[PDB]
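User: Predict the full complex structure for these chains.
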Amino acid sequence: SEKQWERIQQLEKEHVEVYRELLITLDRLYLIRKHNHAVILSHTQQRLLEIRHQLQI
Amino acid sequence: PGVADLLDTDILTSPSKRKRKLDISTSDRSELEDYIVLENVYRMFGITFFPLVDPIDLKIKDASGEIFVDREMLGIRLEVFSERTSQFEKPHYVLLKKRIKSNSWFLFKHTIPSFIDVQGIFDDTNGGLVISHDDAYLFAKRVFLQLVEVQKRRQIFKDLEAKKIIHDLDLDLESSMVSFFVKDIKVELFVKQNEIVSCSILDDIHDFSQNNKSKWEIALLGSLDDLELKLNHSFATIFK
Amino acid sequence: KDVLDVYIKNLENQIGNKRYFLKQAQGAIDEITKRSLDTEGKPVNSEVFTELLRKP
Amino acid sequence: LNDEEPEIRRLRLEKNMIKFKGSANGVMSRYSSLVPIEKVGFTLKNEINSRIITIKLKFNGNDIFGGLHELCDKNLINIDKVPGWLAGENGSFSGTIMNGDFQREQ
Amino acid sequence: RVERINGLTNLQKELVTKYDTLPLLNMNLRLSYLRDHTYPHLQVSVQSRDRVHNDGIEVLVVNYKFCRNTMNPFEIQFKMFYKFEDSTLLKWEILRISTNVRLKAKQLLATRNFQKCLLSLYE
Amino acid sequence: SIKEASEDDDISEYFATYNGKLVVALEEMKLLLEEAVKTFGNSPEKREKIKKILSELKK
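Assistant: Here is the predicted structure of the six-chain assembly.
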C-alpha cells in the first residue's frame, strides 16, 4: 500500500506548478486579444497579477 | 468568459470527446476482439509460428529513418493437451536464427528438456539445414511427437492410482522408472516409449514360486493401455 | 486501496484535460503572433489592466 | 559520448533490468543474478580491411554478469551496444565468438 | 519520450521502441506468419461467441474447411464449451461432418481428444 | 457404420435386397433421364451429372 504513496506526491508535484503556468499563460490570452501588439508590460503589472494568483491559491 | 470562447472545452462537455485525448475506440476494440478468439482457436493444433526480432542486430540505414532487421528470427511454440486435467501445460519454445553467410536456419535457443535431443532432430533434416518454412515444420512436428509421447505415459499411470487399483507410486520425469505398488508384492517396470518392454517383480512370498515368477512377468508384458485389462485378471488369480 | 487508486485516475483526468488546455492556450498565443504585424507593441493601457484585475 | 525527468529515469533503470535478467520484476539484493559466475573468457573475432582482427576479454569476480548490470546503472557503459554474450547469455561458458556466433571452447 | 504501444500499431513504431526480446504485439503481422506459413490451404471461421453470465462459461462454435483439394473440399464443424475462468473446459461435440469423410472421421471419434483429431485431419 | 445406420440391429435383408434397390433405382432413373432429354437438351443438367460422377470417383 506504500507503492501508490510515493506515486501520488510526485503526482502532487507535477499537478501544481503546471497549474500555475496555466494561470499565467491564459492571462496572456485575455491581455493579448484586446491588444494584439502589446505583449510586454511593466514590472508592477506583471506581479500585481501575481498577487491575484497568491490570494486565489 | 472571453477567452473561454476562443479555447475549446468541448472535450469536457461530452465524455466521448475526452477519450482519444487521454485511446481504443469501441469499433476498433470490437474489430480487434474477434482476432484474439481466432488466435486461440489457431493454437488448438499445438504447433504455431510467431514473429520475433533481436534487439541487438537492429540497424538504421539513416537514409529515411526506417529500421531494418539484419538477421531474421523465427520462433516455434509447442503446446500439448492432457485428458484428465483438461488444461494446457506450460508451452515449449524453440527459436531459430538465420546465418548471414549461407542463409540457413540454425538452432539458437530452446526450452526443450535435456532428455529430448532437439539438436539431433535438427541434424536429421535432409540437407542438414532448414531452407524453407515447410522444412522447419517437419522438425517442429517431430519434437511435438515426443513431447506428447513422454507426457502420454504419465497420465495413464496416474489414472490407475486414481482408480485405487494400485497403491502409491513414484515415477521419474520421463516416466521410464515406475514403481508398481499394488499390494504386499512390489513390482518395478522398465517401460519403453509408449510400449511396455520389461517388467520386474521383486517381492517373494513363501507360497510364491520361481516358476510362477517367470510366467507372471511374461503375462504382464504387452501394450501400455492393455496393462490395465491384464491387471485385474492376473491379480484375481492370486486371491482366488 | 481502490479509493486511493480511483483518486489516482482523477490526477491525470484533469491533467490530460488541462495539458490540452495548455497546448490550446500555447497555440492561442501563436495565431496572435501572425495576427500582429509587429511583435513589439506600445505599453498596455492602465484601464485595460484594471479590467484584467477586475476579471476574477 | 556527449554525456532530469523522474518518469524517464525509472525507464532507464528498467531497461537495464530487462537486459541482464530478462524480466522487469526479476527472478531470484536486486543486483544479484539467478546464478553467479566466477570466471568467463570471451574472444571476439572480426574481419576488417580483409584481415582478421581479434581481441581477448578476461573477467574475474563473484557475479560477473551481476557486476556488469550496475555499471550500466551508473551510466559508465552504454546499454544499447551490449552484445548478447556479454549480456549474460551462455552463463559459465567460456568460448570464442566468431562472426556473430558463439562457439564452445574446449 | 514515452510510448504506449497497442495491439494494433504501426510496424515501424514497434521496431523503433522495442528493446526487449518478446513476440511482436502487431497482431495483423502475427496472423500472417501463422496462417499463410504454418497451415497453408486452411480456412477457419468462427460462427458466434456467446457468454453465460450466471456461471461465466463461454460457448464457442468453429468451422474448419480444408482447401488442399478445391474439387473435393470437406468441412467439419466443432462446438466446445470454454470454462472462461480456468484452463479447463467442459465438453466438445461435432455438429456436422461432410459425407465424403464421415467414414474416416468416425475412427477419430474413438480417440476422444482435441489435438489428435485436428492435427491428424490436416495431416 | 452399417449397424448404427440400420436402426434395427440386423442387416440380412439389407444385403438381400441391396441389388433390388439398385435395379429399381436405375430403371426409374431411366424414365427420369428420358423425360428430361425429351423436354430439353439439359446441357446444365448433364454437366451437373458429370461433375457429380467425377466427385463420386474422387471420393
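The radius of gyration of chain F is 16 Å.
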